[PDB]
Amino acid sequence: KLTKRMRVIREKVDATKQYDINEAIALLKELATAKFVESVDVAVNLGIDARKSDQNVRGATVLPHGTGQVRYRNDKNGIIHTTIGKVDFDADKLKENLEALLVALKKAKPTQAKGVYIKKVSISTTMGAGVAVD
Amino acid sequence: ARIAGINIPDHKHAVIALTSIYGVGKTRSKAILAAAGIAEDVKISELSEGQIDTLRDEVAKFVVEGDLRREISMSIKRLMDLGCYRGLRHRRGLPVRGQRTKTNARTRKGPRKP
RNA sequence: UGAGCCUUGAUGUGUAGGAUAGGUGGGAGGCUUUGAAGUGUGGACGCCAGUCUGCAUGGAGCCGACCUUGAAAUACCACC
RNA sequence: CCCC
RNA sequence: GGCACGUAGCGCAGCCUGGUAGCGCACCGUCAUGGGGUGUCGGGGGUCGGAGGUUCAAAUCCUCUCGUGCCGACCA
Ligand SMILES: [Mg+2]
Secondary structure (H helix, E strand, C coil): CCCCCHHHHHHCCCCCCCECHHHHCCCHHHHCCCCCCCEEEEEEEECCCCCCHHHCCCEEEECCCCCCEEEECCCCCCEEEEEEEECCCCHHHHHHHHHHHHHHHHHCCCCCCCCCCEEEEEEEECCCCCCEEC | CCCCCCCCCCCCEHHHHHHHCCCCCHHHHHHHHHHHCCCCCCECCCCCHHHHHHHHHHHCCCCCHHHHHHHHHHHHHHHHHHCCHHHHHHHCCCCCCCCCCCCCCHHHHCCCCC
């Protein structure tokens, strides 16, 4: 159905096996398959019901190494789309960047959260199969 | 296209424009073009201003829109202050072109309320 | 025999307006011979308008940006 | 359908 | 607490399953009659119980509240 590009990338991962943070920056080298500085998107699956006006998010996080002040707001269904940088932005440093991001979200934790705050963090690639970590 | 400063009777014969003007209709258009010396077979988008200013002056002799309704309102004030039967008919807000009103005056007495 | 659930398949005429486009939402290279555009058709849906995919010939070209649109592409990726 |  | 109704004057869909208040009755005025009824024809009549947000838009989403109801709980 596809070429030698997408199938190898999608089989080099595992959707049911939620990788860890340290191993999350281990396969982006093989998941980066564009002839430029391809980005990597991130999704935070949240554990609240944003159907209420009481449960919106809004803020700005400082990238500890730049991409650096990036704004963010949540979603209505509970999936907020954000980003950390590119694939060649020192993958080892991508984990350090992730570290500085989530520490600002746990601090930005609103008080009206009902149920669990966070559910999942999908560190997905822009030209490949993504990854899901706890 | 610019006579009266406000009206733009563009694409209208030298006389059709004057007839379309507010203030005068069929006859004063011809009177104006006769007293000014212009034919009545060409639109206004061809005539220069050296003649349009003259047409403007020639029409500036009669009552104009800005004074047409003023004269009309003056006559209406005369009627309303006299209190005549016509003044009453006008103050009752009824159609105005004639005398008959009972069963056919619906044009400006509007449709039936009930 | 209902329900739940990983996965995939798959979605969603408004009007507008290149256009069956769900919000977001990051984003220009995907696209290609593990065998093009054009066509062969069968199939699924169809507010049947159009999406739509099997083996194909054609056999290696199209496209995101480009453009007016409520919104932008459905280049790819994003969790539902 | 009803009635004169 | 837990759930189910409020739509012209009446009863209702739409519903308290999105984009743009309609259905029948009621009423008014013609037509159909030899005269009527039934009927069509057209017209007034409402803003979605109230309030607040989500929306390019609410009514049809979510919160609270009002009135009325059934179930259930309730040892200053
Ligand atoms: Mg009258």
